Amino acid sequence: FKIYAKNYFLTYPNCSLSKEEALSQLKNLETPTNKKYIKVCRELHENGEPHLHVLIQFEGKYQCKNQRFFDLVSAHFHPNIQAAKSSTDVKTFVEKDGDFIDFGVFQI
DNA sequence: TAATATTAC
Ligand SMILES: [Mn+2]
Structure with missing residues (x-):
């Protein structure tokens, strides 16, 4: 698994972490480039189970080399990782249902 | 892409 991107769009299905607790763990990820912006929202699956979406904006492009680098812990929570197009x-997509939290400053 | 999964611009 390989991604080189400035902006990451993450989706954690069947995830029971609070948005604040996921934001906290993503803030404390040691990455070479600095995180300028993290937004985490909590939404519900059709069956009532919660999931999270995350936008991370890095200061420069970040080479993701490992499919589990964004895994979170309470159980372990594995996301769909994509570069944000x-x-x-x-x-806007992360904000649409109203239950979100921000860190940092949105970029460009 | 893996590896959560129907959730993912
Ligand atoms: Mn959703």
Whole structure:
């Protein structure tokens, strides 16, 4: 698994972490480049189970080399990892159901 | 892409 991107769009299905607790763990990820913006939202699956979406904007492009680098812990929570094609589309998408938290400053 | 999974611009 390989991604080189400035902006990451993450989706954690069947995830019971609070949005604040997931934001906390992602803030404390040691990455070479600095995180300028993290937004985490909590939404519900059709069966009532919660999941999270995350937008991370890094200061520069970040080479993800490992499919588990963004795994979170309470059980272990594994996300769908994609490079955000549009940071502004994702920002809107993460905000749409109203239950989200931000860290940092949104970029460009 | 893996590896959560129907959730993912
Ligand atoms: Mn959702």
